Amino acid sequence: HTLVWGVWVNGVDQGDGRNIYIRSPPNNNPVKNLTSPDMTCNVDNRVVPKSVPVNAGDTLTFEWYHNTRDDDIIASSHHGPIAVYIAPAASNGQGNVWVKLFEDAYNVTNSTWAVDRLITAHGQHSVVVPHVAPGDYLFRAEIIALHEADSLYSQNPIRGAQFYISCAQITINSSDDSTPLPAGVPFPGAYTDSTPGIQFNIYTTPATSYVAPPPSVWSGALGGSIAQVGDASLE
Ligand SMILES: OC[C@H]1O[C@@H](O[C@H]2[C@H](O)[C@@H](O)[C@H](O[C@H]3[C@H](O)[C@@H](O)[C@H](O)O[C@@H]3CO)O[C@@H]2CO)[C@H](O)[C@@H](O)[C@@H]1O
Numbered sequence: 001h002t003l004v005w006g007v008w009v010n011g012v013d014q015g016d017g018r019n020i021y022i023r024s025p026p027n028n029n030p031v032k033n034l035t036s037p038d039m040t041c042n043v044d045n046r047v048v049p050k051s052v053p054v055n056a057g058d059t060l061t062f063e064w065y066h067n068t069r070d071d072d073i074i075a076s077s078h079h080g081p082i083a084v085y086i087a088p089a090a091s092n093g094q095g096n097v098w099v100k101l102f103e104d105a106y107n108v109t110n111s112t113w114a115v116d117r118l119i120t121a122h123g124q125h126s127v128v129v130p131h132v133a134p135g136d137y138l139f140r141a142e143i144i145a146l147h148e149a150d151s152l153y154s155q156n157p158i159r160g161a162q163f164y165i166s167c168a169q170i171t172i173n174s175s176d177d178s179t180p181l182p183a184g185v186p187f188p189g190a191y192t193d194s195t196p197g198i199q200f201n202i203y204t205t206p207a208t209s210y211v212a213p214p215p216s217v218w219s220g221a222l223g224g225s226i227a228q229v230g231d232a233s234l235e
Pocket residue numbers: 001028066067074075077078147
């Protein structure tokens with residue numbers, strides 16, 4: 001159970017974005033039905049009044065929280081991967097539009113899941129804004145908690161992979177468009193009951209064997225991190 005509080009741009013806090021530049025759901029409960037319209041941008045997908053200005057190459061940091069800002073972030077049980085996708089905002093997230101900018105699943109070097117590192121990072125993970133066409137975008141940050149993913153939700157709706165999905169409204173101002181955004185995948189649709197990484201038993205299957213759900217990270221993506229970029233406590 002986790003939500004996005006706001007974003008930072010080049011280590012500058014853009015302030016509380018909830019229902020302002022984040023298409024916030026009413027609560028921190030997961031989405032679990034892979035064919036739900038809620039897979040796009042969670043249960044309250046609508047235009048919110050603001051979009052955060054960035055330029056291509058800026059560091060864009062998502063900041064998550066559990067109940068209050070800079071708390072436990074997400075229950076430690078919720079091991080799993082983190083992904084960020086981008087779509088042009090005029091799509092409203094519909095159609096074959098979501099392009100993956102970031103994936104971090106299980107780090108063999110550190111012996112840690114992305115969610116474990118997200119907690120240590122005070123809820124912060126970042127992407128480099130890609131060199132796409134200037135305009136309005138949705139950045140869809142997705143945490144998959146796998147602690148009940150040994151079952152398919154479609155088998156047992158009390159369990160299943162849990163999707164913590166948050167869509168931020170981002171406006172890309174200065175961009176040379178050196179990597180034009182291609183068509184992408186649909187949400188709902190890209191993940192199905194047979195997709196690798198959706199049904200996974202963390203109690204019996206080694207995390208060294210985990211394969212995150214496709215699609216692969218786009219060739220135009222410039223990278224990211226899971227690391228504290230701003231100190232919320234200094235405010
Ligand atoms: O036993 C089932 C799994 O429970 C996980 O804890 C979650 C609780 O089941 C869930 O009820 C709770 O929901 C809270 C939420 O955390 C809080 O922010 C909100 O204000 O109220 C909700 C309703 O009470 O969330 C927790 C996760 O934080 C365990 O983490 C898991 O190990 C266990 O299998």
